[PDB]
Design a binder for these strands. Structure first.
Ligand code: K
Ligand code: K
Ligand code: K
Ligand code: K
Ligand code: K
Ligand code: K
Ligand code: MG
Ligand code: MG
Ligand code: MG
Ligand code: MG
Ligand code: MG
Ligand code: MG
Ligand code: MG
Ligand code: MG
Ligand code: MG
Ligand code: MG
Ligand code: MG
Ligand code: MG
Ligand code: MG
Lengths: 312, 162, 272, 294, 43
RNA sequence: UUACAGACUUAAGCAGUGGAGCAUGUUAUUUAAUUCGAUAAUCCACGACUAACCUUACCAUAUUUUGAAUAUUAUAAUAAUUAAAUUAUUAUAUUACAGGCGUUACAUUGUUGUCUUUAGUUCGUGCUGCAAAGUUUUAGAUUAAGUUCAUAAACGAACAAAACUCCAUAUAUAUAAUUUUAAUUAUAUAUAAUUUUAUAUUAUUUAUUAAUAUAAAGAAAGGAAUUAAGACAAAUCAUAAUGAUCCUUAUAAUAUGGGUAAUAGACGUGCUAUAAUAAAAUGAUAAUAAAAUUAUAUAAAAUAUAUUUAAUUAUAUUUAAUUAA
C-alpha cells in the first residue's frame, strides 16, 4: 500500500545520487567518477557576476544522475534570490538575467550547450533538468549551503538573536498528530469507497462453472467510481509538511564552539497508528529525515553547518 | 450512457496479458539487473505489455538469485580497528524469455524497450538463431607482429647469423 | 514554425505573447552569438501594452540588458527574503521526488494505453525453421547501452545425431571434438570470442564446423573406429553437479487410499 | 467490453481511435483480466490518460529522463518561476490551518480577550474596549540552579474600567518581559472585582489596613481634591475610578505588597452606607447631599 | 573551469576557490610574509 | 553527612594466556637510513585488506628549477572571424606564485574511541505561597531491567524513548513453457505473536490479581537498527580539508641503489608442537555444506616430468567451457 504506490513512498533508487547498473563494472566505476567531477564543475558555474558589486550566487543541490539504457539525465534543484530586478514591472520580459543565461546553456544554446560537451564525456545522450525551489528550507542541501556561504556575517560573532528568531519562525508549528490522523482517515475513506463499489457491483451481478474461476468483477468505471485524479492524488502524497528542523553550527566563529538550534518534531506518527511501515534510506537514515552538512572557511578556519529537516 | 473505457485503457489496470507458446523455440533471453527491485519489476511489467502487442510469447519475469556484495570498513580514519562498519550491495535479477518469434519482430521489441528504459536498470540479451549446417558466405595479433619486427631488427639479426 | 525565431522580419502581426516567446527563444538559442536586430526591437515595441512597460524602457532594456534594468530600478538593494515565512504554495523537494515518480508512472501508463497497441501493426507470423534443416544454434549476446567485451562472443551448439553423418563418420566426429562433445546430452558446443566482432567470430566457428565435418566424412585413410569415445571430461563435470536421480518406488503407491470425490448436490444442481 | 467506433469516437480524440481499434482486434472479448498483487502498474484512481495534467504529468517541453523531444527542441527558455504550480486551489494548507499572510498585527489585548472568553466566558468586547491596563512592577528575578542562574521576568499589572471594576494580575516568563506582561494582563482580568465607591469618586470614610508588612492609612476626600497618595496606589485608583483620596504608607513600602494590600483594603475594609443602614436598622443621611437637594 | 571563459564569453563565472587563494596571497604580502623571489637558473 | 537501591564486583564450567620453536607488532639499541605515528583502560597482525623495485613518507649519489594550478603580458605555430587586422587553440617565455608527509589535534572541519546520565527536559494552562519559588500523593507498586501498572492540584503538548519498523522463521498468492533445475529452489507481495485460553495451588492492594503448576491452541524460539546530553581541551594536520608560522637552487621535483627485514635484553598478539578419549595412511557407479569469486579473468579434461603399474602431490605442455541460477 505505502510501498506499492508511487505517491506514498520514496523509491530506494532515489537514495543514491548515481542511479545506474552496468554489466561492465569498469564502465560503472567510470560513470560514477564522472558524476562526482561534473557535480564539482557545476558547483563552480553557479557563482555569476554582472559587475564588480553584483555577484549572484545560485545555491545548487547535489545532482541526481539518472542513467538509463539510452540516456543520462542530470537533475538538480537550485535556489536563486533575484535581487537585481525584484520589481512589480515587466522589465524582466525584455532581457535575460544572468541566471536565465546560465540555465539556457545547459540545453538550449545551439552551438555550445553543456549537454553536447557532456555527451562526448559520457558517450551517451545527456539532458540537464534544473528545478527551481522558491524557499531555501525545502531542501536540506540548499539550506546548509546558504547558511554556510551567505549567513556568515550572522553567526561569525555568535548566532544573532534575530538570526535565530528567523530560523524559528520559518514554519507555523503544525500539529503533527492531527495531520497524521487526517492522512489516515483519508486512506480509510478511499479504501472503503473501493470496497463498497465492488460489493455493490457484485451484489448487482454487474456460467456458474466460470463463476468459480474468474475474478473479473466488472467495468473499470464502476470499480473506481468517485476515484479520480482530482481527489485521490493530492490526499495520499507523503512528506508534504515540514514539521521539524534542527540547524547546528561548529568550528571557530581561540577554540572551536558549537551552537545547536532545534525546533519542531523529528518523528512520524503515521507509522505508529497505521499498518504503514517506515523505510530507512541507505539502511540507516529514516525516510522522513533529510540531513546534509556544508562547510566553509573563515579567518579562523573551517566551520560546518549541519541542517536536518523532518518532512511528514 | 457513461463514458466507455476501451480494452486498451482497461488492460493498464490489470496484470499484463501473455500469448501462448506454440512450438517452444526459445529465441531470446532478456536478463534485467538493478540495485533495487522497484524499477526492475515495473520495467519488467512494461516489457511484457510491449511484447504482447508485438505478438511475442513471453514468459517471466523469472526472479534469479540476488547477488550480495559486502565490504567491511573500520569506522575511524586512523586507528581504532576494533569498531568495523558493514556495507552491502544487492544486485536484483529478472529473466524474461521470448519464444516462437521472427528476428525482425524481436529487434523491434529490444529497440522499443531500449528507447523507454528506466533509471538504474541494466539489460543483457542472448539471441538464439537456428541455422543450417552449411551456410553461404559464412555467418595476426599485435604481439606476434612486433615479435617479427623485433627479430628482423639489427640488434637481433646480428646474432641469428649462422 | 521551428525556424520562426530566426526570422524576426516575420514576427510582425503575431500576438503579443508569441513575439515575446520568440524573442526569448532567439536569445536562448544564440547566446553569445546574439546580435540586436531592428526588426526584433520593432516587434517588442508593439508589446509595450501587453506588458505595460514604457516604450522608452523597452529600447533601453533591449540595448543595455540587466544593467539597464538596474538603472531603471534606481538601486540594487532588494530585501533578503531568504527566511520568509512559508505560504503553503510549494512542495518540499522530497515530496517533489514522489510527484516525479508518479509523473513517470503516468507517462508509462499512457504509452501502454495508446502507444503499445500501435505495435500490433508490425506483427509477423512465425516462420519456423524446420528442426531438421536447421539443426545448428548460434547464440549471440548484446549488452544494451554498454560497451562490453563479451558482446563479441558467439556460441555454436548442435546435436551430433542431427548432422546427417553415417555411423562411422559420426564416431570419428565425436572422437575429434574431444572435450567439446557431451555424450550424455549428445551436444557439440564450441564458442569463440577471439575476434573483435561477433560476425567474425560466427564465421570462424562455422568454418571450423565445415572443416570438422569434412574430416569426419573422409574415412579413406583413418576412421578411428578402434579408438573408443573418451568421456573423462564429462565425468568430471558431472561430479560438480548434484544428481537427484531417485524416484518414488512404484510398488509403494497405494491408489486405494486417495481421497474419493464426494457428491455435492448443489454443484450437481447448479450445472443444470 | 468492446465498443463500436461510433460510440468511442464521441468521447476519445481522433488521434487515439486507431490505438483503440487495434487493441479491440488483438485482445479477445472473452479475455479474463487478472489483478496483479506484486507490481502496481496503474495509478490508484481511474484515468483514461487522454489529457495531460499540468501538474501530475511531465511538463511539455521540459527536459527530463523520459522527454521525447530532441535536445535542440525544448521550449523552456525562462527559469525565474516554478515550472509546475501546485494543482487545484494552488495550496496545500492543512485543514484547520490558516495562511500567515499578515504577521505582526495581533493586539495583545485582543489575544487576551479571545483566550479568556474561551476559558472563562467573559465578553471579549468589554476586555478590548472598556479595560485599561497599567504595569506596576517589572523586574528580573533569578533562581540559582546546578546548571547556573536562571533569570525570569516578573510583571505585576492592574486592570480596570474606571467605573468600579479593578483587578490585579501577576505573570512570569523566562523568555521575555512582553510574555510576562501578557500573562499578568491575563491574570488581572480573571481577578477583576467590584469595589464600593462613595459617589463613584472616593472611599467610604477612612481605612487603616495592614497587609503583611504594609500599613495603609487611606482617607476619603472632598470632590475635586484629586489623588494625593503613594504612586502605586495612584495607578490603582485611576483604573478603579477613584478620583479623590489621601493616604500614607508606613513600615513596608514594597510596591507589590502595596498594590495587593490596596485592593484588599478597598474590598474587605469598606462598608457602604446602605450596608451599614440595613445591618443596624437605621437611616444614614449624607448631610452635604441633602443640603443641595430640593 | 578555464575553458568556460571561451565557451561562454557572454557569461562571467567566478571561481570562489581561486578567488579565495588570491586573497590569501595578497594578505600575506601585506603582512610581509610573502614568498621569496625564486632564483633564476641564469644566475 | 544518613539510609536505600542498583550495578560494581567472585564463584562454577570449557578452552586458553603466562613455559619451547617459529610468525608478527612494540620497545630498546644499532645504523648513512633503520620514515612517521598510535603507544593504561581506549597502543602493541594498530594505522597496514599484502614494504623485493613501486608502495615511500627515510638514507647515499646524481639531476630538475614558474615546477601539477590560475591569471597577467609578450613571442610565435594553427584555425576561424573580420577587411591585413581581430578572435580560438597550442607551444615557449614572463611573475604573482605553484609545491611542502615542514611545525602546531592544546588554534580547526569531519570522523572515531571510552565511559557515563538519557520515564527525562522545556513550553502552555491550572493551583499554592506577599514573594524568590513550588506544583506537593511518592522515599508508590512491580520487573532482570521503563519492565509493567497505579496514583496525587494538577492536566496536557512537544520533543529524549519505546514502539512502528527491517532481518530470520511459519504460511498464502504471483512468476518459471521444472534443460540456467537447486520447484527440497529462486524473489516479489501479503499474513502471523509484544502469543492466547481454561483450571488448581501459594501469596497479594484477595480481585476481573501476580507467582506457579496442569490442560488446550499455535511453526513461533532469535536478532538488528531505532536518539538526546556531557566529559576526557582522548586519537587523527599521515584518509582528505582550514588558519597561523616556517622552506622557496629546496624542507619542492625526478632517477639509481640502500633502508623500513639490523639484534643484547624486555613486552603484546598469534601459529605449530610436547602420542593412544590421537596421530598417520587408504576408502571411484565418488557420504554430507554454506557463502563467495571469475573482461586489470576463473581455468576443466588430457599429456609429460618428478616417478614407480596406477593413484596421490608439484610443476610444465595445452587453453575445453564460462564473463556465469
Ligand atoms: K630485489
Ligand atoms: K592530547
Ligand atoms: K507552571
Ligand atoms: K526441478
Ligand atoms: K627495500
Ligand atoms: K599425536
Ligand atoms: Mg575457448
Ligand atoms: Mg579433477
Ligand atoms: Mg556449476
Ligand atoms: Mg607466547
Ligand atoms: Mg626509490
Ligand atoms: Mg623501497
Ligand atoms: Mg601554500
Ligand atoms: Mg618531503
Ligand atoms: Mg499570589
Ligand atoms: Mg599525539
Ligand atoms: Mg615495519
Ligand atoms: Mg558426493
Ligand atoms: Mg587437471
Amino acid at each position: 500500500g505505502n510501498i506499492n504506490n508511487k505517491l506514498q513512498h520514496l523509491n530506494n533508487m532515489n537514495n543514491w545520487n548515481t542511479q545506474i547498473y552496468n554489466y561492465n563494472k569498469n564502465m560503472e566505476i567510470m560513470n560514477t567518477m564522472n558524476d562526482k567531477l561534473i557535480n564539482k564543475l557545476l558547483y563552480k558555474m553557479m557563482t555569476l557576476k554582472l559587475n564588480n558589486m553584483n555577484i549572484n550566487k545560485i545555491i545548487m543541490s547535489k545532482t541526481i544522475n539518472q542513467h538509463s539504457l539510452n540516456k543520462l539525465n542530470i537533475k538538480f534543484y537550485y535556489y536563486n534570490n533575484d535581487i537585481n530586478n525584484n520589481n512589480n514591472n515587466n522589465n524582466n520580459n525584455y532581457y535575460m538575467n544572468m541566471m536565465n543565461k546560465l540555465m539556457n546553456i545547459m540545453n538550449n544554446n545551439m552551438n555550445n550547450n553543456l549537454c553536447n560537451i557532456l555527451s562526448y564525456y559520457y558517450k551517451k545522450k545527456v539532458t540537464i533538468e534544473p528545478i527551481k525551489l522558491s524557499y531555501i528550507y525545502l531542501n536540506s542541501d540548499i539550506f546548509s549551503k546558504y547558511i554556510s556561504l551567505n549567513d556568515m556575517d550572522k553567526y561569525n560573532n555568535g548566532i544573532l538573536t534575530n538570526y535565530q528568531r528567523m530560523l524559528n519562525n520559518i514554519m507555523p508549528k503544525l500539529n503533527d498528530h492531527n495531520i497524521s490522523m487526517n492522512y489516515i482517515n483519508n486512506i480509510n475513506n478511499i479504501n472503503n469507497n473501493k470496497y463498497n463499489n465492488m460489493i455493490n457491483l457484485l451484489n448487482n451481478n454487474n456460467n456458474n462453472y466460470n463463476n468459480n474461476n474468474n475474478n473479473y468483477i466488472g467495468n473499470i468505471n464502476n470499480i473506481y467510481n468517485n476515484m479520480t485524479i482530482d481527489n485521490i492524488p493530492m490526499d495520499i502524497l507523503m512528506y508534504k509538511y515540514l514539521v521539524g528542523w534542527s540547524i547546528k553550527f561548529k568550528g571557530r566563529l581561540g577554540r572551536t564552539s558549537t551552537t545547536n538550534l532545534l525546533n519542531g518534531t523529528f518523528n512520524n506518527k503515521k507509522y505508529l497508528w497505521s499498518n504503514i511501515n517506515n523505510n530507512y534510506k541507505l539502511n540507516y537514515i529514516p525516510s522522513n529525515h533529510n540531513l546534509y552538512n556544508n562547510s566553509n572557511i573563515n579567518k579562523n578556519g573551517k566551520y560546518n553547518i549541519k541542517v536536518k529537516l523532518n518532512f511528514i | 450512457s457513461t463514458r466507455p473505457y476501451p480494452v486498451n485503457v482497461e488492460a493498464v489496470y490489470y496484470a499484463p496479458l501473455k500469448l501462448p507458446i506454440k512450438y517452444g523455440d526459445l529465441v531470446a533471453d532478456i536478463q534485467l539487473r538493478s540495485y533495487d527491485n522497484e524499477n526492475l519489476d515495473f520495467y519488467s511489467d512494461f516489457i511484457l505489455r510491449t511484447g504482447y502487442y508485438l505478438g511475442i510469447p513471453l514468459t517471466g519475469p523469472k526472479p534469479l538469485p540476488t547477488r550480495r556484495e559486502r565490504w567491511t570498513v573500520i569506522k575511524s580514519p586512523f586507528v581504532h580497528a576494533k569498531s568495523k562498519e558493514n556495507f552491502e550491495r544487492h544486485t536484483h535479477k529478472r529473466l524474461i524469455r521470448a519464444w516462437d518469434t521472427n528476428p525482425e519482430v524481436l529487434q523491434m521489441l529490444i529497440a522499443y524497450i531500449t528507447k523507454h528504459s528506466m533509471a538504474g536498470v541494466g539489460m543483457k540479451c542472448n539471441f538464439f538463431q537456428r541455422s543450417e549446417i552449411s551456410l553461404d558466405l559464412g555467418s595476426t595479433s599485435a604481439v606476434g607482429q612486433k615479435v617479427l619486427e623485433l627479430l628482423d631488427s639489427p640488434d637481433f639479426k646480428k646474432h641469428l647469423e649462422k | 514554425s521551428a525556424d520562426l525565431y530566426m526570422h524576426p522580419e516575420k514576427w510582425k502581426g503575431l500576438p503579443p505573447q508569441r513575439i515575446l516567446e520568440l524573442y526569448w527563444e532567439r536569445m536562448a538559442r544564440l547566446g553569445s552569438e546574439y546580435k540586436p536586430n531592428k526588426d526584433e526591437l520593432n516587434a517588442l515595441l508593439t508589446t509595450s501594452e501587453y506588458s505595460n512597460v514604457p516604450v522608452n524602457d523597452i529600447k533601453k532594456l533591449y540595448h543595455r540588458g540587466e544593467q539597464g534594468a538596474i538603472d531603471i530600478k534606481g538601486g540594487n538593494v532588494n530585501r533578503d527574503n531568504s527566511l520568509r515565512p512559508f505560504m503553503f504554495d510549494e512542495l518540499p523537494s522530497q515530496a517533489q521526488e514522489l510527484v516525479a515518480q508518479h509523473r513517470e508512472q503516468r507517462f508509462y501508463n499512457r504509452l501502454a494505453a495508446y502507444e503499445l497497441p500501435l505495435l500490433a501493426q508490425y506483427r509477423q507470423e512465425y516462420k519456423r525453421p524446420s528442426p531438421e534443416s536447421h539443426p545448428v544454434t548460434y547464440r549471440y549476446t548484446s549488452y544494451v547501452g554498454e560497451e562490453h567485451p563479451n558482446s563479441r562472443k558467439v556460441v555454436l551448439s548442435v546435436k551430433t545425431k542431427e548432422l546427417g553423418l553415417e555411423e562411422k563418420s559420426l564416431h570419428k566426429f565425436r572422437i575429434l571434438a574431444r572435450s567439446r562433445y557431451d555424450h550424455t546430452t549428445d551436444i557439440f558446443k564450441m564458442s569463440s570470442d577471439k575476434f573483435e566482432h561477433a560476425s567474425q567470430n560466427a564465421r570462424y566457428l562455422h568454418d571450423i564446423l565445415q572443416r570438422l565435418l569434412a574430416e569426419s566424412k573422409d574415412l579413406t585413410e583413418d576412421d578411428f573406429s578402434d579408438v573408443p569415445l573418451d568421456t573423462r571430461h564429462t565425468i568430471a563435470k558431472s561430479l560438480r553437479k548434484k544428481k537427484r536421480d531417485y524416484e518414488f518406488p512404484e510398488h509403494w503407491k497405494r491408489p486405494e487410499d486417495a481421497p474419493k470425490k464426494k457428491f455435492d448436490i448443489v454443484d450437481q444442481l447448479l450445472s443444470t | 467490453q468492446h465498443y463500436d467506433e461510433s460510440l468511442l469516437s464521441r468521447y476519445y480524440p481522433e488521434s487515439l481511435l486507431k490505438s483503440i481499434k487495434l487493441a479491440q482486434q488483438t485482445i479477445p472479448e472473452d479475455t479474463k483480466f487478472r489483478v496483479s498483487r506484486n507490481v502496481e502498474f496503474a495509478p490508484p484512481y481511474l484515468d483514461d490518460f487522454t489529457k495531460i495534467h499540468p501538474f501530475w504529468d511531465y511538463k511539455p517541453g521540459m527536459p527530463h529522463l523520459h522527454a521525447q523531444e530532441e535536445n535542440n527542441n525544448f521550449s523552456i527558455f525562462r527559469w525565474d518561476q516554478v515550472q509546475q504550480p501546485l494543482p487545484g486551489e494552488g495550496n496545500i494548507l492543512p485543514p484547520g490551518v490558516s495562511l500567515p499572510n499578515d504577521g505582526g498585527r495581533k493586539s495583545k489585548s485582543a489575544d487576551v480577550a479571545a483566550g479568556l472568553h474561551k476559558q472563562t466566558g467573559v465578553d471579549p468586547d468589554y476586555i478590548t474596549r472598556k479595560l485599561t491596563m497599567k504595569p506596576l512592577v517589572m523586574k528580573r528575578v533569578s533562581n540559582q540552579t546546578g546548571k547556573g542562574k536562571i533569570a525570569s521576568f516578573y510583571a505585576l499589572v492592574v486592570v480596570g474600567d474606571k467605573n468600579g471594576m479593578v483587578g490585579l494580575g501577576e505573570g512570569k516568563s523566562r523568555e521575555e518581559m512582553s510574555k510576562a506582561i501578557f500573562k499578568a494582563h491575563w491574570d488581572a482580568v480573571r481577578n477583576l472585582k467590584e469595589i464600593p465607591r462613595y459617589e463613584n469618586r472616593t472611599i467610604y470614610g477612612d481605612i487603616d489596613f495592614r497587609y503583611h508588612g504594609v500599613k495603609l492609612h487611606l482617607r476619603s476626600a472632598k470632590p475635586g481634591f484629586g489623588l494625593r497618595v503613594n504612586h502605586v496606589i495612584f495607578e490603582i485608583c485611576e483604573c478603579a475610578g477613584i478620583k479623590d483620596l489621601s493616604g500614607k504608607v508606613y513600615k513596608s513600602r514594597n510596591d507589590m505588597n502595596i498594590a495587593k494590600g490596596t485592593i484588599e483594603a478597598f474590598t474587605k475594609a469598606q462598608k457602604t452606607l446602605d450596608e451599614v443602614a440595613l445591618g443596624r436598622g437605621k437611616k444614614l443621611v449624607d448631610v452635604r447631599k441633602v443640603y443641595y437637594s430640593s | 573551469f578555464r575553458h568556460l571563459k571561451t565557451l561562454y564569453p557572454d557569461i562571467e563565472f567566478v571561481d570562489l576557490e581561486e578567488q579565495y587563494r588570491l586573497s590569501m596571497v595578497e594578505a600575506k604580502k601585506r603582512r610581509g610574509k610573502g614568498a621569496p623571489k625564486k632564483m633564476k637558473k641564469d644566475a
